Design a binder for this molecule. Structure first.
Ligand code: HEM
Ligand code: HEM
Lengths: 103, 103
């Protein structure tokens, strides 16, 4: 029972997307980085977390992989630089991705 | 649920210690970083993972907190530089720590 608390209480932002690119987990550190409360994010397509100017390209990148210093755009349109760590998580016969993000 | 695979399959080394500083989780990325298999680590004390020259000082730092670019020393004695991210995790009244580590 300690795996969920270890991610929930992580000092890094944690974002898990499912096989249809919907956000399934979004922790309080991620709420602070993006300016969204998790209730606004869960169950929605990852697109809402992607900077507006990368929404054309980003789906092709995920699709290609299914087959880093990054600039994050907040809810209010302001931007911050982050470090992203991505892991591909194979479970339940599905491919999930976990992003671990820090300022 | 999904929170175990998200840490088990993480590209970052992940080390979880319990309230007694015993290692309770040590993923394959951490095995590669330190050169220990998890059977050599689980149930053992945190100090087996601390470089010998930091074993005098490290216990007082954990104690103080209970009450980063770091040089890791592998099983074979070689050393590598890492980045550590620590989180304090409270669950069921007990304090755990999770280290996420990368080369
Ligand atoms: C601030 C939000 C994000 C930004 C700015 C962003 C940016 C990018 C960029 C620019 C790439 C193309 C490759 C590269 O790094 O050069 C990429 C690839 C990728 N992104 Fe994101 N991303 C964001 C969020 C996420 C999230 C939340 C996830 C999944 C939880 C994710 C999953 C992926 C994957 C799987 C790829 C392809 C992996 C690969 O590089 O093979 N991204 N992203
Ligand atoms: C290569 C192994 C490690 C080295 C070289 C290392 C080194 C250090 C050093 C130099 C400090 C004192 C200064 C500082 O806070 O930066 C520190 C504090 C600490 N370390 Fe480690 N450590 C290692 C592994 C771990 C692991 C695996 C854990 C727990 C999973 C851990 C838990 C802590 C805690 C809880 C503190 C006190 C943090 C604070 O006061 O904010 N360390 N460590």
């Amino acid at each position: 029972g300690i795996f969920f608390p270890a991610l929930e209480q992580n000092m890094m932002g944690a974002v898990l997307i499912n096989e249809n690119d919907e956000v399934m987990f979004f922790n309080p550190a991620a709420e602070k980085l993006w300016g969204y409360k998790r209730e606004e994010v869960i169950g929605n397509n990852i697109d809402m977390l992607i900077p507006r100017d990368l929404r054309p390209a980003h789906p092709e990148y995920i699709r290609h992989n299914r087959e880093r210093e990054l600039q994050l755009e907040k809810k209010d349109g302001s931007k911050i630089w982050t470090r992203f760590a991505l892991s591909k998580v194979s479970a339940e016969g599905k491919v999930y991705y976990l992003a671990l993000v820090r300022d």
